[PDB]
Design a protein around this nucleic acid. Structure first.
Ligand SMILES: [Mg+2]
Ligand SMILES: [Mg+2]
Ligand SMILES: [Mg+2]
Ligand SMILES: [Mg+2]
Ligand SMILES: [Mg+2]
Ligand SMILES: [Mg+2]
Ligand SMILES: [Mg+2]
Ligand SMILES: [Mg+2]
Ligand SMILES: [Mg+2]
Ligand SMILES: [Mg+2]
Ligand SMILES: [Mg+2]
Ligand SMILES: [Mg+2]
Lengths: 177, 48, 195, 110, 205, 215
RNA sequence: AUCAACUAGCCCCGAAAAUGGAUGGCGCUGAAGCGCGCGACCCACACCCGGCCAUCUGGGCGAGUGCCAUGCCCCGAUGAG
RNA sequence: GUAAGCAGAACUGGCGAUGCGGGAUGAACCGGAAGCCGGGUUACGGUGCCCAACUGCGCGCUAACCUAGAACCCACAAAGG
RNA sequence: AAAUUGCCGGGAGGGAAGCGGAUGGGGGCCGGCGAUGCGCCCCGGCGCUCGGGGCGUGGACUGUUGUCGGCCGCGCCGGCGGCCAAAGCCCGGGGGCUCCGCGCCCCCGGCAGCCGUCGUCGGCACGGCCGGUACCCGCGCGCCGAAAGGCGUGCCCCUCGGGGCACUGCGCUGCAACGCCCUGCGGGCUCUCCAUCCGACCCGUC
């Protein structure tokens, strides 16, 4: 269903000028929540990297990329640049998820939790699939095993829909894992 | 409703092939990634 | 109305045709930017900078939740850049324009506001400008026409409902999460809730 | 319970009168708030929306042969996510009316 | 929390192992709604945060006394029933007629004094320790807290609950026997009725 | 198809057909007739001071109420208000005023053939086969009251005297109920257990949620 | 399998005032804390529709069946002091 | 001026003259400016009880044996461990 | 006359009372507080009114339901298009990986089941508030039909189903059904007292 991020690719170039009548072309792969935010981030990176502003630039194409096999789990790596309270740093993060799109969500959530870093402070330098037997993080590496088995230490007791739930119940619930 | 010729032959196999090839070419260039043979300091961190 | 529907349909299909044609030829087609903006004011009339007050008196946004149709030209878009924290604007599509002009269409006739509940009122306000019907008016706005100045100064600044389903924060730009500024297409997804 | 006296059919689904439509600092006594026994969802009150209720109380003096009075109203629309409803009455309820029970029939039924 | 809306004359709560503040908010809203509640075995209410933390909270509470007239100041209660009644009063608006009428509907007891033995004692799922405290985090029983802030009836509740538990166990054994003979009756009537009872085959368990 | 019906009705040509201006081009030759000047009474008995306005013989011809989808002739209703609440009845036919016409039958339920508003009934999913009940005799005039004059204030000598005497419901209605309940028990014994069913009344005992409860 | 440094999140030490005592209170610990989200939802005399009052603007009403013409009727907007 | 809820200026807005919703409480902080009513929807802010709205769906970190911590102004904490 | 006091009757009171907005319960009070008349029609006298009778109707307040409008809210469903569409499913092919999470991963080509994201067209069921007609609608001028409604001619269209258009005229033009009460222990009150909820600092003034 709905994904809070979408990996667009934005293609843009400076406006035509009398010399250099075909200005050179730049492509980028940006995460955002929708088109207009992806575009606004694209001009950010071509105004702090390639010295081109939206006024003196022009956007030619924006595509929304999707994922190949949503049904399979893919060990993802993200190399990311972030701002702490007193400087900048560089992180590497390994996730297991069915899509890069979900991995990015999981990664913003992890940076907002482990470091109180918000979205406006985070950059995704490079994203890739770091397939198994080459993963680096222990929490990724420990799910690389068939014949895996673990019981559920944490299982909310909860009625299937809001209708079936009342305030008094005779019997103390039987919880067992 | 009773499986009449609902959308039938609309375009031929050579056209439906070149269209698919152009789409896949745009997909290759649309998910293409960077070389990273520029940043001689973060080579080992970036993996390349 | 027949040939307006025909040409709307032809333009919509034609864009797709050129985009596939450019893709198959190798490069890509770049859509020709929107000629028209729908701008709706999203801040109260209290504690405004006087420049902002004058800019909004010219954009005709003189009360919260008014929504006006604007040509895109450099003078206008750099006039929007000045009051951007106060407005939410974007590119309306055909359903947006038609159902606003029907469901909330009022005319500046003799400085009085007339509910365009019939084709007649167009005949007086306009018609010197070759607009006879509500569909002529909708077209000549949407495909920004030669007489769009007159066919827009005829209209009254649309009075909108408050946004059903709520709103996001009005303090930030849309890119930062809020509502102000371009939402380029999503003014479509918004007018359905302002209306 | 068995071999009992009282009413022999319940054609109404009981509920509590709950308060008024309040802000954090206002009351609008026009619209009361009502909880139905058994509704636990905002779309379960879809079926009650419109059905008519009666506040039944009894005064100090007989009138027309009874102490019982009854002020009539109906479930206008849902309120909140847990099946509380808003009730519109012919006259606004007493504030002693809140905490007591109100009868929600199924008359104007569909 | 808007209430269950249930129809009982009185609803009892076996308050053993429930979070004090959570049970307190649920019960406080029930009272304000107007449904008469009676909470028992209050001596068992588990409270998050260790016993030393709840101690220092209560001994800070002891300091608060009116300087010029201690007889007029914050009345520090010790028994768990009154600790609960005060925790619930802190959640009910008790300076109006509505709020005092609400508290008039609350009756809190240590143990289970009659006639609340021969009754079903309802537990509130939204407040149980097992469902609201992660296993392994500090908690203390309001019985131990009052036993250490100077409620001199921890013993006297204890003999009475030992007596009530043995008196309940004997009767539970009696009802086991009565239910196994009702089960042999269950099958004996089913075998005596054939097609008379087909309609209950698909909705029975 | 509410809006397709709107357009199909709204066509100018279809309005010509509907108003039937042909057969008005029939009677008066090959043209639409003239109209003339009525109201030549010229005999006003009294002249009001206020500007006079005549009685409204209402020319608006309202639509008929739509009988619910889940109502079929033969459907077992649930009465909900009035003295027969909970009573289960069988729906005979939705009569010309708009109100439903139901029957107990009076042999089992005590609910005679009586008129009930559609609002206060909940159709159950069960049906009966009653295409051999002869109901045409029932209409609005059968039930129209001709309520009598208010000069009769019920006094200590009227109270039980009307109970003790029989100047009440008439004997043709007595015989009526006999014919209908006969021809309708002959249809009820077909459906098993239904006589006992109708003999019961619906009670929403504890642990019953109408939004959940089907019918 | 591990050793050291650096870094930064929350927590801790650093952290002392006099009436009894204040995350607003009770309480809260797979939070009812902190950071990020998602569905709804609650809430202003704010926005929309509708009725009514008033102000303002703009119209209609004589070979008068003709009127507190200083009147009546219609349209539109507005309403802080 | 060491600073001040201090003294003096520049641009704008506010209070003064102004209600109303939120920030518990506040002239000027956030939302927003108003005839009197009915209906709908929102802004700021919230949904554990007081108190109208979720003990909602998710993911992490904190365990405070000091009053852990919990709202723009705002009712502080520092060097340093 | 008022402040102020006494008796008589009533009302209420857990460290103020008073005030504003809701109704609820008590009182005190209102018959212009709320109706019984209109036409036709037959005498019997006094065309016109009164006396009798037959006749269809008709009143304050209040309730319910119905049907049209208006605004609104909520729920469910179907089609279309865009996207390289992607995917699993069905088949075929193509690479490295070497004991590995190993019946391992990645990619490419065919096909004719359902399945995202935006856009859009449509169907319906439910409800809430207001209005109820001098024009917009609607009605008669023909028949059939208790009634929703149907019924003709000629052109254009596909050609089943069936659809589009057409010539247009006079006049008229305050939506309905049934209740409940009617000097009552009724109705409701802007008057009084009280209870509860929300609000609520003491006015003038520099
Ligand atoms: Mg809503
Ligand atoms: Mg908000
Ligand atoms: Mg106080
Ligand atoms: Mg004037
Ligand atoms: Mg409202
Ligand atoms: Mg609440
Ligand atoms: Mg005196
Ligand atoms: Mg006295
Ligand atoms: Mg008062
Ligand atoms: Mg009163
Ligand atoms: Mg309607
Ligand atoms: Mg002076």
């Amino acid at each position: 269903v709905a994904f809070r991020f979408h990996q667009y690719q934005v293609v843009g170039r400076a406006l035509p000028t009398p010399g250099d009548e075909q200005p050179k072309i730049y492509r980028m792969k940006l995460w955002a929540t929708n088109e207009v935010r992806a575009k606004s981030k694209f001009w950010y990176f071509l105004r702090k990297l390639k010295k081109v502003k939206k006024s003196n630039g022009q956007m030619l194409a924006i595509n929304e990329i999707f994922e190949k096999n949503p049904t399979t789990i893919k060990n993802y790596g993200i190399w990311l640049r972030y701002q702490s309270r007193t400087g900048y740093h560089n992180m590497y993060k390994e996730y297991r998820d069915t899509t890069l799109n979900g991995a990015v969500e999981q990664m913003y959530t992890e940076m907002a939790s482990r470091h109180r870093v918000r979205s406006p402070c985070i950059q995704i330098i490079k994203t890739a699939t770091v397939n198994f037997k080459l993963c680096k993080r222990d929490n990724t590496k420990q799910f690389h095993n068939s014949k895996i088995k673990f019981p559920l230490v944490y299982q909310k007791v909860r009625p299937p829909t809001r209708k079936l739930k009342t305030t008094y119940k005779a019997t103390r619930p039987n919880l067992f894992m | 409703k009773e499986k009449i010729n609902s959308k039938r032959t609309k375009l031929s196999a050579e056209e439906a092939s070149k269209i698919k090839a152009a789409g896949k070419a745009w997909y290759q260039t649309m998910i293409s990634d960077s070389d990273y043979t520029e940043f001689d300091v973060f080579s080992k961190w970036l993996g390349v | 109305a027949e040939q307006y529907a025909g040409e709307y349909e032809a333009q919509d299909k034609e864009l797709v045709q050129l985009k596939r044609e450019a893709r198959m030829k190798g490069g890509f087609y770049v859509s020709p930017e929107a000629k028209l903006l729908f701008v709706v004011r999203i801040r109260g009339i209290n504690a405004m900078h006087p420049k902002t007050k004058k800019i909004l008196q010219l954009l005709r946004l003189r009360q919260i939740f008014n929504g006006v149709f604007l040509k895109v030209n450099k003078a206008t878009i750099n006039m929007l850049r000045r009051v951007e924290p106060y407005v939410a604007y974007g590119y309306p599509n055909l359903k947006s324009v038609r159902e606003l002009i029907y469901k909330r269409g009022y005319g500046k006739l003799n400085k009085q506001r007339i509910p365009l509940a019939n084709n007649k009122v167009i005949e007086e306000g306009l018609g010197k400008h070759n607009i006879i019907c509500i569909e002529d008016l909708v077209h000549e706005i949407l495909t920004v026409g030669p007489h769009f100045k007159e066919a827009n100064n005829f209209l009254w600044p649309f009075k909108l409902k408050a946004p059903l389903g709520g709103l996001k924060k009005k303090r930030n730009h849309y890119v930062e999460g809020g509502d102000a500024g371009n939402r380029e297409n999503y003014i479509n997804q918004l007018v359905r809730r302002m209306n | 319970v068995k071999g009992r006296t009282g009413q022999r059919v319940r054609l109404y689904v009981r509920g509590t009168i709950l308060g008024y439509k309040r802000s954090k600092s206002n009351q609008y006594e026009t619209a009361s708030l009502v909880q139905i026994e058994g509704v636990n969802t905002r779309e379960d009150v879809a079926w009650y929306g419109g059905k008519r209720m009666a506040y039944v109380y009894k005064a100090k003096t007989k009138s027309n042969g009874t102490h019982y009075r009854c002020i009539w109203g109906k479930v206008s629309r849902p309120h909140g996510n847990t099946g509380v409803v808003r009730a519109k009455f012919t006259s606004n309820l007493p504030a002693e009316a809140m905490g007591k029970k109100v009868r929600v029939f199924m008359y104007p039924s569909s | 929390v808007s209430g269950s809306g249930v129809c009982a004359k009185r609803v009892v709560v076996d308050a053993r192992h429930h979070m004090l503040g959570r049970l307190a908010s649920i019960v406080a809203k029930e009272l304000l709604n107007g449904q008469r509640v009676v909470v028992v075995r209050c001596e068992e209410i588990c409270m998050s945060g260790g016993l030393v933390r709840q101690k220092m909270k209560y001994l800070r509470f002891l300091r608060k006394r009116m300087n010029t007239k201690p007889s007029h100041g914050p009345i520090h209660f010790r028994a768990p029933a009154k600790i609960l009644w005060r925790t619930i009063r802190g959640m009910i608006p008790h300076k109006t007629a509505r709020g005092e009428a609400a508290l008039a509907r609350l009756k809190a007891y240590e143990g289970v004094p009659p006639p609340y033995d021969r009754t079903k004692r309802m537990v509130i799922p939204d407040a149980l320790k097992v469902l609201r405290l992660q296993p392994g985090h500090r908690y203390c029983l309001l019985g131990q807290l009052s036993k250490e802030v100077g409620w001199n009836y921890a013993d006297t509740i204890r003999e009475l609950e030992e007596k009530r538990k043995e008196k309940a166990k004997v009767s539970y054994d009696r009802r086991k026997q009565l239910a196994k003979l009702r089960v042999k009756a269950e099958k004996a009537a089913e075998e005596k009725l054939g097609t008379q009872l087909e309609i209950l085959a698909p909705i029975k368990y | 198809s509410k809006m397709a019906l709107g357009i199909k009705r709204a066509s100018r040509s279809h309005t010509y057909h509907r108003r039937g201006l042909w057969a008005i081009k029939a009677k008066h030759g090959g043209a639409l007739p003239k109209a003339e000047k009525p109201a030549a009474v010229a005999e006003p008995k009294f002249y009001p001071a206020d500007d006079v306005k005549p009685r409204t013989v209402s020319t608006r011809k309202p639509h008929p109420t739509k009988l619910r989808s889940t109502i079929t002739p033969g459907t077992v209703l649930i009465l909900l208000a009035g003295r027969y609440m909970g009573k289960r009845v069988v729906f005979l036919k939705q009569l010309q005023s708009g109100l439903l016409l139901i029957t107990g039958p009076f042999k089992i339920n005590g609910v005679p053939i009586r008129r009930v508003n559609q609002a206060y009934v909940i159709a159950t999913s069960t049906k009966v086969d009653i295409s051999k009940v002869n109901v045409q005799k029932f209409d609005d005039k059968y039930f129209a009251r001709e309520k009598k004059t208010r000069a009769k204030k019920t006094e200590g000598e009227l109270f039980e005297s009307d109970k003790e005497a029989t100047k009440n419901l008439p004997d043709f209605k007595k015989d009526d109920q006999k014919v209908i309940d006969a021809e309708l028990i002959k249809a009820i014994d077909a459906v098993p257990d239904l006589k006992n069913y109708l003999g019961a009344r619906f009670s929403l005992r504890d642990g019953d949620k109408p939004h959940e409860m089907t019918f």
